[PDB]
Amino acid sequence: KEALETDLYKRFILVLNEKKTKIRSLHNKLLNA
Amino acid sequence: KEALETDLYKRFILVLNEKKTKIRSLHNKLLNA
Amino acid sequence: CPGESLINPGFKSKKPAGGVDFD
Amino acid sequence: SNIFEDVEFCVMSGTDSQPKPDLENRIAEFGGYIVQNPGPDTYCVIAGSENIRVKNIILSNKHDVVKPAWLLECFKTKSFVPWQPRFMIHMCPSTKEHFAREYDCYGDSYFIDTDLNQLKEVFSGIKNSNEQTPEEMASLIADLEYRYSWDCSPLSMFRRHTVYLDSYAVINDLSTKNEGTRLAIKALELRFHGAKVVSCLAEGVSHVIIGEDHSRVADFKAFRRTFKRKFKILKESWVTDSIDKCELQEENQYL
Amino acid sequence: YSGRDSLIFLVDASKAMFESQSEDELTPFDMSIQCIQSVYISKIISSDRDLLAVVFYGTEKDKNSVNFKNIYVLQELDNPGAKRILELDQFKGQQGQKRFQDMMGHGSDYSLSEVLWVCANLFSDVQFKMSHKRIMLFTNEDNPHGNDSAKASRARTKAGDLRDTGIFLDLMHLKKPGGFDISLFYRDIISIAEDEDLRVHFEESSKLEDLLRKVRAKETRKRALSRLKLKLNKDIVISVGIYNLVQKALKPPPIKLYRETNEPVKTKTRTFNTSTGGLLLPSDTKRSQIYGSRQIILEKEETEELKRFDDPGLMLMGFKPLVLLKKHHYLRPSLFVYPEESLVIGSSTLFSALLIKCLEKEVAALCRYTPRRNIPPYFVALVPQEEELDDQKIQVTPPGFQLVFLPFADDKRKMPFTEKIMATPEQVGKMKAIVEKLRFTYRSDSFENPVLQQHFRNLEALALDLMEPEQAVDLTLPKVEAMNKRLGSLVDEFKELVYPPDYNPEG
DNA sequence: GACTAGATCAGAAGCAGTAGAGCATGCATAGTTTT
């Protein structure tokens, strides 16, 4: 129980940064175009 | 443990939904325009 | 002397406003 | 250091570990033209206590308030670090429009990665959400795990499985609880591990746990045969031997 | 009564003052601090020129002119302000109690003689004229010196000296575990020992409740608007004083502050000609008025001379029956006329004779009134006013004359003519029932000005940095729910008996 | 000799109260335009 919280935080971080990178790429490409 | 898991997961899904909404809005509207 | 103010000497302690109290 | 050249700042908070006059002295040392009352020219209004003056400034959307930590960050780094949602306690409409472009409704930003501390701040921002039901939440969790491939985690691996037990003298009888046995702690550990313990023998039950009493195995087999979907018969040894391995052991050896 | 009221707040700092008998109750120290703050706020609102001080005894540190031990003078006698209330606000709770213990200390010995000496010394330093001198002793120890008899005798001698000098001593005893017995020691120290104030008290004194009752109305000392001459004839003249027993209360005028440092700014108005641009003295301008397609020019001195009719004073005109006076002829708030022997000797006797005989004959003295110079005359009626006292012999209606202003022909107005429709007896009876249901007793001090009270609450909140302003209850608002409950079906019956079925008063 | 203390008079500043001027709100009435 003392570690499940951080186990969940890690996955949430991974997914959130993945989505952030996706939006970064989308906006950057559109702004360039 | 059950309460912690459910609360944290709800927390994360809200933020993920908001991020998804904004990325979708960009990719759809700003590309179409 | 009786019923004098403990804050402002020389003045009588005014009773608090009670508004309308129907009989 | 003239990092705060030709700027205006106001302070209306003396309730903090650092007294307001000390803050004014530091401001004057850093070059910010202190002002005792906000006006159209001020670039901020810092107040670490939500007193009446802060509320009055809030009630007018003509300026913005900043948590005193902004000055601490500016002084420590000696740099004009911009505002972020964590510090601000209220924004003008224009600053709100500016933030909405590079920031979501919550503190989490769009164009910059996040760190554990930032996510903690975000998870402390919003208030609450209790608009779901157990089944809906479980379906959401299962969908997330399946999509993002987190099933390898030590926990939540019993989620897809519904588990029944022979804790009642008569099947489907809630008035004959057999509390006071190792089966209770077995089930409690199972459910702690994400197992969906079901007290009613519905057609959707997928896993059944049996102890040393095999008297009612025939009834379970008959019910399984009657049902369209068959549930494998499992013993309490499988879950015990699987807990230490943190994995779902094959049911063939524990049928 | 001339001078300022001086008050010193002595607060004990012994251990017994920092213990709570019950979990949900206030320690004696907290009660004392609350009372001090309440009195400070009341003084700020009511009398801002009075002097207050705060002293502590029983502490470990010391701060006084005489360099005595175990006496900390926290605030010397000075006018009240927000800074002092905030300074006291850091002892208002348990954390405040720890802060007080760290800053000064507690649990040490003391001598009441030294404490009273320091209080007298504080009184001596004041350079203004003090009309009253008071000390309030906040303590819960009935026998401060039971072990030492010499200290008790010294305290008694010092208390006697202070009483001789003209210093009032009051004991505000707080709750004690075993009970407070004034009989033991504090009888001699106290200025006045009431007959009822001799039994053992198991609860805090009744004076704390009055102290915590916040007064938020200005108290103005007696003062004469004018000293005039009442002239029965060209040779018979008496001296009278005019007072105002009713005066409208206004918000304190705003001041103009500079925004960058909150320092006052002074203003000046000047007039300069458009062409030259230079300043024009008041002597380089005239006055104008247009009438009948012409311009009439007069100097300022003549403009003021237009208003000169007679010298200041009251001129007798005759006597009028009180029936001829009318209640709906009110024009201006009435004034009070009282004798004054300072300017003319023998005025009191003639005034008394006139008052007595006017009361006997039921007449009012008609007079011409000119308060100041360059003021056109008005007509006034002096109505006799007898002395009326309440049960406790506190005078409620003073003796003298009531000056009522009478209107001129120009002060009345013409009303549109309206046909009269009288009501049948049944409607009058139903409305009589409605009136009788809502009867109540009225007193002149039963209402408060909501605007002024809210203004003072807001100002206090802004000054002391409170979380939110306190909201005043408006007693002028009707109690609609209670009236509806009391009246019952009377309203419906009256509406049925007086209004047609399709009337719709709202529309 | 020098110096201090008490009493008293005069002038001035502060405060209270009235008067006079100015600023904003609404509507009465009439006029003008539209149909």
Side-chain angles (χ1 to χ4, degrees), chain E residues 45-71:
Chain E
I45 297 297
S46 77
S47 74
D48 50 36
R49 54 201 321 271
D50 278 13
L51 305 146
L52 310 169
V54 188
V55 182
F56 290 110
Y57 72 96
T59 83
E60 279 311 17
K61 266 206 203 36
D62 52 4
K63 194 186 147 179
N64 37 22
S65 307
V66 198
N67 270 355
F68 273 116
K69 292 264 168 105
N70 304 356
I71 290 158

Side-chain angles (χ1 to χ4, degrees), chain D residues 51-88:
Chain D
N51 53 20
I52 183 52
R53 304 188 159 291
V54 178
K55 286 164 82 81
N56 278 354
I57 275 284
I58 295 278
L59 259 292
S60 101
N61 304 263
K62 305 339 194 330
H63 288 124
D64 55 307
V65 192
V66 185
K67 161 142 197 311
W70 172 47
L71 276 59
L72 276 312
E73 265 45 53
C74 275
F75 300 163
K76 288 304 308 187
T77 76
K78 293 184 80 178
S79 292
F80 182 20
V81 68
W83 302 326
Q84 282 159 67
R86 159 171 72 271
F87 314 139
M88 257 188 162

Side-chain angles (χ1 to χ4, degrees), chain E residues 61 162 180 204 243 256 433:
Chain E
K61 266 206 203 36
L162 260 58
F180 201 80
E204 49 84 44
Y243 307 90
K256 282 151 197 321

